Amino acid sequence: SQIRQNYSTEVEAAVNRLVNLYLRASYTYLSLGFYFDRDDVALEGVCHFFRELAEEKREGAERLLKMQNQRGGRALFQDLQKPSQDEWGTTLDAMKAAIVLEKSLNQALLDLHALGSAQADPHLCDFLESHFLDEEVKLIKKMGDHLTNIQRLVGSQAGLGEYLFERLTL
Amino acid sequence: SQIRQNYSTEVEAAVNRLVNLYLRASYTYLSLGFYFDRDDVALEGVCHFFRELAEEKREGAERLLKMQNQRGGRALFQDLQKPSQDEWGTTLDAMKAAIVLEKSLNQALLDLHALGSAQADPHLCDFLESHFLDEEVKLIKKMGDHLTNIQRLVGSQAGLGEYLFERLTL
Amino acid sequence: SQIRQNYSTEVEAAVNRLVNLYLRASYTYLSLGFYFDRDDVALEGVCHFFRELAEEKREGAERLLKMQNQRGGRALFQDLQKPSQDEWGTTLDAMKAAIVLEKSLNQALLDLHALGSAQADPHLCDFLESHFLDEEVKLIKKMGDHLTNIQRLVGSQAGLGEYLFERLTL
Amino acid sequence: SQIRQNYSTEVEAAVNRLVNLYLRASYTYLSLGFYFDRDDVALEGVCHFFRELAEEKREGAERLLKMQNQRGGRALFQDLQKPSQDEWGTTLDAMKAAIVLEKSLNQALLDLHALGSAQADPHLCDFLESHFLDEEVKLIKKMGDHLTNIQRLVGSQAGLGEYLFERLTL
Question: Cβ of D140 and A69 within 8 Å?
Answer without folding.
Answer: no
